[PDB]
Amino acid sequence: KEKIDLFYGALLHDIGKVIQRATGERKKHALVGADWFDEIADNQVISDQIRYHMANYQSDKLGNDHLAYITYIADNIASGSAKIWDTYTNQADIFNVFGAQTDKRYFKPTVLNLKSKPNFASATYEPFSKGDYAAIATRIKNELAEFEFNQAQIDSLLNLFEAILSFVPSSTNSKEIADISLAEHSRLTAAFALAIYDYLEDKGRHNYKEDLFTKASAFYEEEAFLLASFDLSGIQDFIYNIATSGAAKQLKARSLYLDFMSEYIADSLLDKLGLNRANLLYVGGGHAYFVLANTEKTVETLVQFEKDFNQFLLANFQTRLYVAFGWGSFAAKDIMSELNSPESYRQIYQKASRMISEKKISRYDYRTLMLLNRGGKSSERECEICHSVENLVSYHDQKVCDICRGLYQFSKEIAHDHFIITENEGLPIGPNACLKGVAFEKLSQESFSRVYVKNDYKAGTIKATHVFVGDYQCDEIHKYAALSKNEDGLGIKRLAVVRLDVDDLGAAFMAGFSRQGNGQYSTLSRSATFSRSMSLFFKVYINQFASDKKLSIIYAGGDDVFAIGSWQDIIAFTVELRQNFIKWTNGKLTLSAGIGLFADKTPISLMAHQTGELEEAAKGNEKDSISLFSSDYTFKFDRFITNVYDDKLEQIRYFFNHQDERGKNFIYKLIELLRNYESEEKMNVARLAYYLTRLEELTDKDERDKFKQFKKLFFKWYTNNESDRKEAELALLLYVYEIRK
Amino acid sequence: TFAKIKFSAQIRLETGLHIGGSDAFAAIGAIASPVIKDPITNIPIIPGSSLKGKMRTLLAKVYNEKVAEKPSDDSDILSRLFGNSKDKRFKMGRLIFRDAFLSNADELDSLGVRSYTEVKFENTIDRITAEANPRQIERAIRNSTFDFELIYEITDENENQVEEDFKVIRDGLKLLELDYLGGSGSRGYGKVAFEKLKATTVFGNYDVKTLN
Amino acid sequence: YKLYIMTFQNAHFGSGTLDSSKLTFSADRIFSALVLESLKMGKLDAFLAEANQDKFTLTDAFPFQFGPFLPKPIGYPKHDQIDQSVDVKEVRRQAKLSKKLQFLALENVDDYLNGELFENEEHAVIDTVTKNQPHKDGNLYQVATTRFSNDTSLYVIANESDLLNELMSSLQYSGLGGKRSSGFGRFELDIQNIPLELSDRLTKNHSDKVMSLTTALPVDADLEEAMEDGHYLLTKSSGFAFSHATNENYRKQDLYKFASGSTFSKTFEGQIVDVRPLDFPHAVLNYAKPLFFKL
Numbered sequence A: 001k002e003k004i005d006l007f008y009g010a011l012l013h014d015i016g017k018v019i020q021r022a023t024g025e026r027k028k029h030a031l032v033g034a035d036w037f038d039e040i041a042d043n044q045v046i047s048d049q050i051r052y053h054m055a056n057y058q059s060d061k062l063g064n065d066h067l068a069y070i071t072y073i074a075d076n077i078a079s080g081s082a083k084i085w086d087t088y089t090n091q092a093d094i095f096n097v098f099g100a101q102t103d104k105r106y107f108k109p110t111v112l113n114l115k116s117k118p119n120f121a122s123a124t125y126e127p128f129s130k131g132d133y134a135a136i137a138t139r140i141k142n143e144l145a146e147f148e149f150n151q152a153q154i155d156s157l158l159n160l161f162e163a164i165l166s167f168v169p170s171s172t173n174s175k176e177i178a179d180i181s182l183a184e185h186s187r188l189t190a191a192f193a194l195a196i197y198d199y200l201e202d203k204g205r206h207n208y209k210e211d212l213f214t215k216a217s218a219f220y221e222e223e224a225f226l227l228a229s230f231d232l233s234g235i236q237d238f239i240y241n242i243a244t245s246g247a248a249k250q251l252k253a254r255s256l257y258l259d260f261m262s263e264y265i266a267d268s269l270l271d272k273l274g275l276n277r278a279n280l281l282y283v284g285g286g287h288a289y290f291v292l293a294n295t296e297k298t299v300e301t302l303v304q305f306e307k308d309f310n311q312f313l314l315a316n317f318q319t320r321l322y323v324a325f326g327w328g329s330f331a332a333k334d335i336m337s338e339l340n341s342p343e344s345y346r347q348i349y350q351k352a353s354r355m356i357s358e359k360k361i362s363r364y365d366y367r368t369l370m371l372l373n374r375g376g377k378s379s380e381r382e383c384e385i386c387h388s389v390e391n392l393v394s395y396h397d398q399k400v401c402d403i404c405r406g407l408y409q410f411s412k413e414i415a416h417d418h419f420i421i422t423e424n425e426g427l428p429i430g431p432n433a434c435l436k437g438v439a440f441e442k443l444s445q446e447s448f449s450r451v452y453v454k455n456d457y458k459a460g461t462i463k464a465t466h467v468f469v470g471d472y473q474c475d476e477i478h479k480y481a482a483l484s485k486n487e488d489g490l491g492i493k494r495l496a497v498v499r500l501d502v503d504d505l506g507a508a509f510m511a512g513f514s515r516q517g518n519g520q521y522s523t524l525s526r527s528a529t530f531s532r533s534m535s536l537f538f539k540v541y542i543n544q545f546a547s548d549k550k551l552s553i554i555y556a557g558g559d560d561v562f563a564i565g566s567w568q569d570i571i572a573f574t575v576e577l578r579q580n581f582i583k584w585t586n587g588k589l590t591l592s593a594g595i596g597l598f599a600d601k602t603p604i605s606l607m608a609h610q611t612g613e614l615e616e617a618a619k620g621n622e623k624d625s626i627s628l629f630s631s632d633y634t635f636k637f638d639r640f641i642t643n644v645y646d647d648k649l650e651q652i653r654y655f656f657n658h659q660d661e662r663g664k665n666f667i668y669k670l671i672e673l674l675r676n677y678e679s680e681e682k683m684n685v686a687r688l689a690y691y692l693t694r695l696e697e698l699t700d701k702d703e704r705d706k707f708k709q710f711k712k713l714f715f716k717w718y719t720n721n722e723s724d725r726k727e728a729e730l731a732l733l734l735y736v737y738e739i740r741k
Numbered sequence B: 001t002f003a004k005i006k007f008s009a010q011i012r013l014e015t016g017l018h019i020g021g022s023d024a025f026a027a028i029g030a031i032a033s034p035v036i037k038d039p040i041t042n043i044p045i046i047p048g049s050s051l052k053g054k055m056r057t058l059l060a061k062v063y064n065e066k067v068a069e070k071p072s073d074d075s076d077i078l079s080r081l082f083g084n085s086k087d088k089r090f091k092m093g094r095l096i097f098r099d100a101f102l103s104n105a106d107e108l109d110s111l112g113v114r115s116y117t118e119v120k121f122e123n124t125i126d127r128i129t130a131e132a133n134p135r136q137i138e139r140a141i142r143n144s145t146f147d148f149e150l151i152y153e154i155t156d157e158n159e160n161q162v163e164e165d166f167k168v169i170r171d172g173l174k175l176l177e178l179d180y181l182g183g184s185g186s187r188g189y190g191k192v193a194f195e196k197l198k199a200t201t202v203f204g205n206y207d208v209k210t211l212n
Numbered sequence C: 001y002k003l004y005i006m007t008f009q010n011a012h013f014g015s016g017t018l019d020s021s022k023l024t025f026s027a028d029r030i031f032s033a034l035v036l037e038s039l040k041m042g043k044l045d046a047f048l049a050e051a052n053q054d055k056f057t058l059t060d061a062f063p064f065q066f067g068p069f070l071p072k073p074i075g076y077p078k079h080d081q082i083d084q085s086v087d088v089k090e091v092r093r094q095a096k097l098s099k100k101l102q103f104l105a106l107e108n109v110d111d112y113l114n115g116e117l118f119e120n121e122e123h124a125v126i127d128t129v130t131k132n133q134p135h136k137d138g139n140l141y142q143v144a145t146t147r148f149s150n151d152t153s154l155y156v157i158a159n160e161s162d163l164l165n166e167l168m169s170s171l172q173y174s175g176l177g178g179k180r181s182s183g184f185g186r187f188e189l190d191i192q193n194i195p196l197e198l199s200d201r202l203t204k205n206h207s208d209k210v211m212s213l214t215t216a217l218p219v220d221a222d223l224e225e226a227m228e229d230g231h232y233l234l235t236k237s238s239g240f241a242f243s244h245a246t247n248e249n250y251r252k253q254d255l256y257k258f259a260s261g262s263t264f265s266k267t268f269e270g271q272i273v274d275v276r277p278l279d280f281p282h283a284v285l286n287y288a289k290p291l292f293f294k295l
C-alpha cells in the first residue's frame, strides 16, 4: 500500500518535462505531469508526491509521516525550472566528457527499434532543439490507460519506460548536467528512494523533519548505503568444453544456460529482500552492481542467500560454478558536495573489489568440501560431453548424463520468443525454478517470465521482463564450411573464428571523466549512462547489422562475444563493425579482436581455446593490435584497414583477376619468395627483380595499363621499410584464398 | 629380468616420400599439400605415429591367425608389440617409437641448397578429355638420415618367448624396406632403408644376443 | 637429499581431457609411474613400504632455464602491501599480468613481496597435430604436443638413496603422460653433486607464514584450524584405473586437491587416502606430500 505507490513516484517525478516540450505550457515541470496523470488514472496517494517537489512547500493535505519527503533526497543523488523559453542542448554526448575534448556531438530522440536505423551523434542535427516533436508523446497514451497499480504489475512499467525514452534528456542545465538521459535518471533514483525508507524503518526512525529535511548536510555524511556485487566464474571454461565432434549442435544451447543464470540473481535476491528491479545496473555475463542500504537486516539476507545458492550447485555440477558476493558500505558525500579528488569516487569500488579476489581462492570450507571426496560411485561408462556421470540415459548413441540432457531439447527451443519459468520442468537454473520456451500459449506460469526483442510493437498482455541477448541464428554449426561457395567456384571448406573484445573498458572507468576542476565528474548517473549506451551496440545493434549475411552470434554481451560461420564475410564484417564504434565514440575508445581459422569438424575444447591466445600475444606492442593466422602477423589492428585493406586489397581485385585460371600458379612463387628473409638480405632483393619482370612480357601486351599499375606498386611496397614487408605479404596471401576451388 | 633393448639405426631415405598433416598448418598457404614439419625450426621432421600404424598393418598379413577387421583385435601373437584395448592379459605393447629428426644438416649446408622441400607437378586424365585438374604436391629430399629409436623391454613374468620375438622385429623392419612409407607411396615414393642396424643395452641386466 | 634434472621435448601432458594439454604436470603423475614399473621389475612389496616413510617426499613440476623457478605466492600482495592505486589506468595495465603469471625466477623470490611486476618469460609455444584411422571411415581425433625449446628443463627433488637411483633411471626409456604408445614422455636423467645453496628452506616443523606446495591434500583430522585464515585453489584430475583382471575399466573417484604455491598458517600432516570404486586386486593410493617453504 504505502510502499507499492512509492516505487511509481520516483519514476514519474519528471514526466511533465516531455509534455512541456510538445504542448506550449509555461509554468513548472513539477505541475504539468501532476495534472496530466490524474486525468487518465484515478489515485490520491501518487497525486500528492508528483504535485509538490521543488519550490512549492505546500504544508497542506499532510500529517506528520507521509511518503512525499524522501523524494527530494534521492532526486539530488542522481543530479549534480519554471518558465521555459529556449533550450541549451538536446541530449548531450556522454563520450564527449570522457577522455579528451573533440568535436561536438548531438543525439536525436528517435525510436529504439531493432528494425530502425540507429541515431548517430554528430553536428548535423540542430543544437537549438525546437519545441515540438509530435511523436514523443503520441505513443504514450493507450498503454497508460487501464492498468492496475499493485504488486503483480510493478515490473512491467520499467520495460516500457525505457523503450522510447532512452534518447530523452533530463534536466538540461549547462554542460555538466545535460548528458543524463531521462530513462536512466528516473531509473537510478528509484533505488535510492527505497533505501532511505528502509534505513529509517530498521533503525526505528520516522520523518520528524516536516517540510524539507533541514539535516541535509548531516545525512549525506553518514554511511547509510551498501554496494553489493557478484563475480560469476566459470564461463569461458564450462561452455567451451567438449570431447565429441557430433555435439556441435548444442553449442548455442550451452551458451544460453549461463546467460539466464545471471538474470536470475537479479530477481530472487531483489524480491526476497523486499525491493524491485530498481537495482538493475547492467546485468549480464556475471558482472553487475547492486546498491542497497547500510542497515542490519539487509546484511543477513545476502549472507544466507549465498549459502543456499551454492548448495544445489554441488551435487549436479562439481566446482567450476561459483558466485562470490562483494559488499561495500559508502557515504553519499563521496559523489557530491566536497571531495573533488578521484580517490573519493574510486574508494567506493575498492571496498567491494578486494574481497572478490580473496573469496574466489577460498570457496568451499569444512564439511562442505567432504561432499565431493566421499567415494561411492562405481560407474565405468562416462558421457564424453561434460565429464560427469549422473543419471545416464541413451538418446543418440552414447550415454547422456543429466547436465547435457536438456541442452539437446533446448537447442530446438530457442526459436520461441516467449519463455515460461517453471519449477521442475526444463533447465535447472535456480533452487526450485527452471526455464523453457513456449509457442505463445501460457498454460501455467508459476514464477516469472523473461523474453527478448521486446521494445516496439509489443506492449499488450505479455507481462515479461525482457533481457539483452542475441537470438539471430542460421542453421546448425558444423555446416558453414560447405555453404561457403557461390556458383562459379570460390573458397574452400574452412571457417574463421573471431572473438571481439573492446578495450579501454576495465581501466579509466571511474576517473575517466576528469577534464575541468570546476565540475566533480563523479555523479553515479554519469557512469550509469556510460555503460548503458555501449551495451546497446554490442548486443541489440549486432542483430540489426546481421542482415543479408549468414552468421550465428554466440554469447552476446558488452565485453567479449563469439562469432562463427563462413569466412567469406566474417573477415570483412569484423573490421566493418569497428568502423561503427569509432564514429559512435568520436574516436576515443579502441577495439581489439582475433580472427582465427581452423579445420572442419574440430573439437571446441581446443578450437575455441587456441583462437584466444592471439589476443594475449598481440599485447606485446601496446593495446591496439590483432593477429591473423599465426603469431607473426601482429600489426596495429587499425593499420590493417588503412594499408592492407585500403590500396593493397582494393587495387588488386580487378588487375590480376584477368590473369587468373591460365596464370593462377604464377602467384605461388610470390608468397614463397618472401619466406626466407632472415637469411641474406642482399640476395632476397636481387632474386625478386627477376621473377617479377617475367610477368609483363608473358601476359597480354595489348593493354599497357594492365600490369603497369601493379608493377610500380609491388616494387615500392617491398623496398621501403622492414616492417612494411609484412603488409604486402599478407595482402597477397588473402587473394589466393579468395579464388580457390 | 628387466632391461631396455635399444635398436639404434639410421633411416636413409632412398626415395623422396610425402606425409600429409593438417590443412593450412606449419606453412603459409593451404595449397600444394603442406608437409608437416617442426614448430620451432624449419626442419622437416617425421612423426612417430606414422611408423606405428604402418608397421603393424604390414605385420598382420605375414604372421597372423585371425582376419584383421579392426585394430587391437587382429590375432594375438602380434598384438603384444603395440597395444590392445580388448584383451586384459597385457595393457600396452613392448615397443616405443620416437619422433625422428633430420640429423643430416651437419653436411647438407656445405653443398649449398635452397630449401629442404620442393614442389612437384602432377595431373590426371579423365579418359575422355585432356589434362584434368593440374594439381601439385610437395615432396622431400633423398639421401637423408634420421635418428630412429626402437626401445624394447621384457615384462619378466613372460620371459620365455624372447627368442621368438627377435625374429618378428627383424622381419618387420626388413619388410618395411621393401614397401612404401608415409603417404601416396603407390607410385614409388616411400621405400626406406634402415642403414647401420645395430643393437645395444643401456642398463646392465640382459646381454646382447644378436647385432643385425 | 639430492635432486634430479631432466628435460622434455616434443612430448605431451594432458589436463582434464585427452585432446587438451598444458605445459607443466601434477605431482601425482610421477608417483603413479614408479609403482607401475615396480611390479613389472620385481619389487612391488618393497616400494610400497618406502614411500610412506615420512622423510621420503616428491615435488611438483618446476621449470629449469639457467636457474630454478618457483611459483608465485597466492594472495600476495594484499591490499596494504601493494602500492596505493592512484591512477587506475596505470595499475590495471600491470596488475592483470601478475594474475596470469606462471612461475618466478630464483632471484626474484625476495623482491616480489616489496613491489615487482613484470612479464614472465615465454617457455614454449603450444603445437598440435592431427591424425585419423583408415579402413574404418568414422574416426577423427586431435592431439597436442609440448615441443620445448630455448633450453627448457623440468627438474625434480626427491630423497636420494640406494634404491631410487635404479628406479627412475629406467623411466627415461618409457613414457610419462600423453600418448605413451607413440613415444611421448622420454627424458634424460642428469645427476650432479652439490645442490643449490639458495633453495634450502624446505622443512616440516614450524609454521611461521610458510607456504605448502606439491598440490597436496590436508589431513581429514586437522582442517578447521589449518584452512582458517588461508588460501587455496581447487583443480581437477581424474581418469580410469590400471588393472589386468577387471574387464570393465571402472572410473575412479575425483580428488579435487589444491594448487602449487598456496599459503597457509599451520603445519599439515599428509596422509594416504584410499580410492576404490568397486573392487580391484591391487590398491589405488594417493601420494602428494606437502612441502613448506620459509619464504
Ligand SMILES: Nc1ncnc2c1ncn2[C@@H]1O[C@H](COP(=O)(O)OP(=O)(O)OP(=O)(O)O)[C@@H](O)[C@H]1O
Residues within 6 Å of the ligand: A282, A287, A502, A503, A504, A505, A506, A507, A531, A532, A535, A558, A559, A623, C092, C093, C096
Ligand atoms: N558495463 C560494465 N559495467 C561494469 N563493469 C564492467 C562493464 N564491462 C566490463 N566490466 C568489468 O571489466 C572487467 C573486465 O575487464 P577487461 O578484461 O576488459 O580489462 P582489459 O581491457 O583486459 O584491461 P587492459 O586493457 O588494461 O588489458 C570485468 O571484471 C567487469 O567486471
